[PDB]
């Protein structure tokens, strides 16, 4: 754990170094290095120059500040100078064609998570392969081909299915992807069907994929969630910890999971700034709102676009607003704007990440007791956990001799059994929200939920041209 | 744009008004008698009968070149039946003068069909029904003459298309090809477009390969399934020609009130406004005799409910919906005291009720299990990030719907699809309590043209128009 | 026709009265003793034996020795005290009483008396071919073989299944008609398709078919005809009461086997009618019979209520409803020594119509073919579709003739399955109500307060010692 | 026979007391230290380890001696020591007392140990969630056929899975399993097990095992106490003029088994040492260990905690809220006396099938046949209708595929009906003073009924 945060602190400091120099290369001032927008541009720029299969002057649209006002600028640097900064900071490493698949894959994951909060899909045109309703399973879909194998665990079932669908139109790329899909998928006939993949027709592989994709909208898959912030926010931490002796050091807050990752976020919010200008997504005449933007930033850093809005409302220091109630723009440097600082104590509560199966078909960190064996001849109702028995039977009663048609029916009947149980179904049983002060998890709390939990919901309160359209 | 449509509709409405006015002159119908609903029903039907070549060629006598039309003749609030007459070419001359027709008569035939559906459970005084009695609610456009079936296809129910398929299957036991395709190929394509997605649509593809036994079971299964797995049928406000003439007169005689082009709509609030405006000057007949008992006097408010129900095709609609928008208490079929709407031997003239619709709605037209307008979304579930205990938020109905569209194989036999249809019924029936049609569909006040104040009606109770009550009029 | 029905019924009732009064005279039963239920039970049973041409032809074939005397155990009384007596008459006299009053037609007449006796026995005893748990489907199972064909519609699915099993067992040492009768009663669907295939089925398949159709009918309720079958003495108590109070409704006014007039004929018979109270009950020869307990069984036997929902019956009677083993009632046979107790008038304070069709269908003002709505307006609403009626519609309309035995068996299991899950929405006799006896014109319909155990044969802590 | 059995039990318990008292002399256990539960546990295990013929066949350098870990008290504080006796001296104790003869008594001795272990810790053959069906799992294969009835479906399935990984012992086990299983298609599949392929065999075992979590099996239960606790009953009875005799308390079922348990707690002892299960630094709690002991004696590890709570005169705590170590001799430790009247309520044992309660106050009426056309809901018992269809509509012609499908819908019907499912209908709780079941009582059942529930008030 301390051994972990020490390995984290090393890579974070090395990223602050890369970020500080690239800003110097592109003429970003010391105060402007703390504008979130500049980090989006700098990190993107690195990914573009690094993109070997895409392959000198380099251009970077950035923000320039003057008092409280801001303006966009076009920075310029030489391509050899850009590659020399990475080479000189990262010595005995960089052997990867994509600099470091982790390093840039994380910057690309933040960019993907922000895109998910800002748009249902609507940015990368409409190059969709899967149905519109399966987009909540499309975590990390904005990622480049390069970063998907290394950023696998963070990827959604929809993303992996889309990658397989694109492929269809020591190792094997197709086998590699179905393997990642197999690990993510809810245990049972869906995993059996993955093992039977490549034994299928081109017409059957499609049914296989689309079925497992649809089924996962109820039979939840396992996806890894980390706290991914822009580099300029890790700079704000490093700065605040050094400008404040008593406060927690960068090493203490150098985490991507647990309470330290939430403290890392709030301490970054002391010195971090964002831009505010005219125009929002789909309406150029509406002004950007500072509280609405802050929500989208906190959601982007945690990948909250598909999370239960009620869970989110419980940890947030501002009222939770649905997507089309927010007045927020591109996050790209505005032509003209104003500087707005970040909200210091945004996250009053914190929570652990649900990195494993939400229904917990194995009960790894749970009690294994699902029923009682009667000793006394005393009247009692049935005490058997119906959903855990359903989870166990699907996992346990798999027929290896089963045909594609046999497996297709078993998945449909797995969906039905859980859909008939709908009201009693519980995800992440045993998981609670804790206060920031509550480091030890000594005092658990219930989020107190009810009503629409969909972020991409259309409401009467929606902003003109959005959810109204 | 909606204005380009209203201008086009107002042109059709004005041609129809002229055809009507000219036909009334030829049959000696007084200026005031032109506004009697019954006269429109008789003139429209006459125009349909004369222009039907199949019936005119089979009719052949002097009487074959004659056109008899039972009309209402009123004195001073009191009316009487009269046999109007014109020669066949004089009827065809009026048509040649106003027009340079098929679709025009199809619409008139759709009002008569929707009036018949409200008036009768059977509708034709004939027990020769191809479908099971309980599937009568899927018989939109059943009374519609074979000629008008292709043009009005969209307005027809699954039961009307299935009984048309069954008709072809009975004759071809005991042939045409107009497109490109054959009448049966055309009919199964129409059913496939209406039918709820999933195995029912897949059984439509395999239909031409099915043997006469599998074919009949297929039809009945798709028909029974359609009673929960609601099909796609288009609806329009189709009112008589005399009612459009009563819209014309009122807009002319009253400045500031919307024009005929403003009210020229068969959809939205402007259709409700056109119906409500048409009722300022329209009239109908009240006589002795109702459907069932020949000695019961007709009720005015009861006849006004049927008229309203005929124009919007509300026979098979949820009574609680209709109740929330009409200006009288909603009565079930057999509580109503109304006659066949044909001109009576003797009766009294009654004016329609102005502002009969206090509330309005838009038409279904798409699959009812799908959502309506701007206000829904595409998000069906959540993807948990924080390990915090929460219930399943997945939309079971929307997921069931997505899986019906997305999970198609092509490699399923008759029997396999038959079980898949039955399971599809099972899945939705098991969901009854939380199953909802037209999610995002609201009721609006008549004055609320903007749709700024959406309202959900106070549902519950028996929804069926053809249910029996204690109040059921003696003999019915 | 409803008034014409009662006139035709009265003609039969008056003929039954004449047969009954003349038999009592032949058997030396006094005018006051003719109103005793136990004598009506004994006299009707007696006639069924004398008219049993199979037994009677065999009885003289076994015989000079042809002593054709008819013996009958009867109740004789001295006001409130009563005692058993053995009556006697000659077969030619018993036969002449039939011929003189009537004129083939006698079968239907005796078939009904035997039905009242099966209905009486279904109440008194809960108990050999079918499973014990399926006994609630064995109505008319005490009817002798000769009466089962006439009284077909009154027979339970278990009674018909028992007859089919009995034919199949004798064939292991006609059926076609029993199958047709079973087919009619059964809930439509794969159970009816399994009836059509039954002659092609092997002996193992045949046995599984009958057992499954029976088990399934315990939820997928069959059609059984019900009429109010009252003993002959009871109809005599109506005749006598009607000609006593001239203002009160006549016999013709109360000559009904169904509706409020049947319930009114019952309450009228109750003024003058009498039964016996003795020492000994069913299962316990030491316990004294209770009057209110015996009156409950009488009303139940007259309406065939043994298997009917307890809560429904409870809501219609003038006494607190008791489960079978809370009752102190013996045989309805003449006691050796006992007392005379008159029946309880106004026993039924509420009435209802008989449910002779499939329970899952609708009754009264709900018999309409409309079971769904076709959406015209884009207005948010729940689905209005009648799930049980739609499941019944698919059962009749669909179903493959290309179905094998195992295909049809798996389908029955699946049909029982859907309805077992549908149990929240499942309503039997929908649109049917309970009415105050005073309300003839079915106005002000009431709904019984149902909840708790509805099984008459349930075991409680109130259960009488030995039972 | 009820008091004739007590006579046969008294004879057997006394033989055990004689074997025990002699073994304790062989290993140098002081008269006071004989009444320590931990000493009865080690002595019993020693006799099983010495009577293990194959293990003795398995083994100058040969130490043909017996080694036993025992508790040595002194004052009130205690210690752990290693006792030794010559193997033929130990054998002579068994010959002096006994001349089935030994296997049955050591089987029950092993059965108490399995019950103790199941209350202490939550099997590699079966899935983890199926552990509540593994009664008698700890038993060595010598004891399994003898104690058959007492074994859980999980145990029997793991015995079959072991044979597969290599009458016959397989045929034996399948018929033992057939008797236990919920009646219907599971019992039919058991009959087909010989004709199933190895893949179908594994599916059948796991499906039968998983099903049993809802479709409850038939398992025999008895009151099993260490020999020292019966030595305590034998001591206490001879002391009080009012007190019932040992023969009067010689029961393994009914009220007398509870009165025997309580009478034993007046003179029996255990130890409070440093170290609990998992946390080698936490001090053991007396009342906590007393709950484990009562639960071990009655095999209550998997029983509904709410039932157990209503019967015991101390607050019911879930497994990880307990400060209890293994019942092995502790290095340091302090002698703690057992609690004199632990059970204030009692109940009879299950032993039969928990769902089908034949007779009791449950009649054959399962449904109603409507007469009047009155609106009402369906009154038909689904549970009972499902149960009847399993007896009446069995198809011998069914293959593996068809029987598996039927198991699944049998589970599905029961899962759907969970709200209306009741186990041991007409089964009640009674006061210890209520000897002839006159005033039945019902336990207040509401919360989580699982003993192995994690809780917030846990122990790290």
Residue numbers in the entry:
A (entry chain A): 9 to 63, 81 to 194, 215 to 514
B (entry chain D): 8 to 67, 77 to 116, 125 to 198, 206 to 210, 215 to 511
C (entry chain C): 8 to 70, 77 to 116, 123 to 146, 153 to 198, 218 to 511
D (entry chain B): 8 to 66, 77 to 116, 123 to 145, 152 to 195, 216 to 509
From the paper:
All these results suggested it was a new genus of the Orthomyxoviridae, temporarily named C/swine/Oklahoma/1334/2011 (C/swine/OK) and then Influenza D virus (IDV). In this paper, we characterized D/NP and solved the X-ray structure of its tetramer. We demonstrated that the C-terminal D/NPTAIL presents all the characteristics of an intrinsically disordered protein and that is involved in the nuclear import through its interaction with cellular importins-α.
Full length D/NP was crystallized in sodium malonate as small fine needles that diffract X-rays up to 2.4 Å resolution. The structure was solved by molecular replacement using a starting model of the monomer of the A/NP R416A mutant. The molecular replacement using the tetrameric B/NP model did not give any acceptable solutions. The asymmetric unit contained four molecules arranged as a tetramer, consistent with the observations made by electron microscopy. Based on the electron density, 87% of the model could be built, from residues 8 to 514. Several internal loops were missing and the C-terminal 50 residues were disordered. The oligomerization-loop of one protomer plugged into a cavity of its neighbour. The loop was then stabilized by several kind of contacts; mainly hydrophobic (by the side chain of the strictly conserved Phe-421 and Val-423) and of several aromatic residues lying in the pocket of the neighbouring monomer but also the salt bridge between an arginine from one monomer (Arg-425) interacting with a glutamate of the neighbour (Glu-352). The overall folds of A/NP, B/NP, ISA/NP and D/NP were very similar with root-mean-square deviations (rmsd) between 1.6 Å (for 383 Cα for the comparison A/NP with B/NP) and 2.9 Å (for 340 Cα for the comparison D/NP with ISA/NP). Twenty or 71 residues without any structure are found N-terminally before the cores of A/ and B/NP whereas for D/NP, the core starts with a very short version of an N-terminal tail (only 7 residues), which seems to be compensated by the presence of a carboxy-terminal NPTAIL of 51 residues. The sequence analysis of D/NP showed no import signals in its N-terminal part but suggested the presence of a bipartite NLS within D/NPTAIL (514KRR-X14-KKRGR535).
